[PDB]
Amino acid sequence: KKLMAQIFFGPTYYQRLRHMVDDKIHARARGPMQVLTRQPVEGRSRDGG
Amino acid sequence: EVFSRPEWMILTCLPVPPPPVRPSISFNESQRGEDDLTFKLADILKANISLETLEH
Numbered sequence: 152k153k154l155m156a157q158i159f160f161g162p163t164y165y166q167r168l169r170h171m172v173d174d175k176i177h178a179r180a181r182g183p184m185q186v187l188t189r190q191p192v193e194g195r196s197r198d199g200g
Numbered sequence: 201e202v203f204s205r206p207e208w209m210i211l212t213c214l215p216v217p218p219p220p221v222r223p224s225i226s227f228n229e230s231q232r233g234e235d236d237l238t239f240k241l242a243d244i245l246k247a248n249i250s251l252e253t254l255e256h
Contacts, residue, residue: 186223
């Protein structure tokens with residue numbers, strides 16, 4: 152069924168940006184702790200809190 | 201009178217904090233890696249003995 156509205160279709164030059172979700176996604180439930188402070192470590196890489 | 205006497209603002213006995221305040225981040229068997237505070241205390245200690253021997 153036809154759309155009551157007419158859509159502005161056509162090409163646009165789009166770029167893929169350097170931030171992937173599977174590169175950002177992070178979760179932790181216990182893990183590495185700093186030596187001095189004894190609190191969770193920092194960053195995805197270090198499995199931080 | 202009990203907790204804060206003016207005389208105690210001048211130091212004669214300097215407390216040495218235990219290792220967990222100045223952690224030896226000891227990596228590998230051969231290497232060590234002492235904390236900044238450990239050096240400053242060693243620096244204080246070196247300086248103290250120079251003076252202790254010098255005056256004696």
